[PDB]
């Protein structure tokens, strides 16, 4: 090991990955824990449905 790993590509010296920015966001993200079984409706996939079968050719691209 050097100051950096064997990867010497766009280095400088040392850094906390990357940081520094202006807080432009407000508040709201995705839920965690409750797998609510009541809201569903749009069940399964709408590309190849499941593994492609019978119906599935090219119609729902």
């Amino acid at each position: 090991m050097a100051t950096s790993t064997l990867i010497k590509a766009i280095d400088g010296d040392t850094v906390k990955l990357m940081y520094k920015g202006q807080p432009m966001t407000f508040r709201l993200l995705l839920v965690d824990t409750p797998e609510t079984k009541h809201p569903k409706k749009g069940v399964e996939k709408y590309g190849p449905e499941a593994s492609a079968f019978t119906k599935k050719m090219v119609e729902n691209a």
Partner: peptide, 21 residues
């Protein structure tokens, strides 16, 4: 650069810069 300013770790594996060991 502002996203990873908060995203320090994923799946128990912490993040690393090229400028670091």
């Amino acid at each position: 650069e502002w996203m990873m300013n908060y995203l320090t770790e994923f799946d128990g594996k912490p993040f690393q810069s090229v400028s670091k060991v």
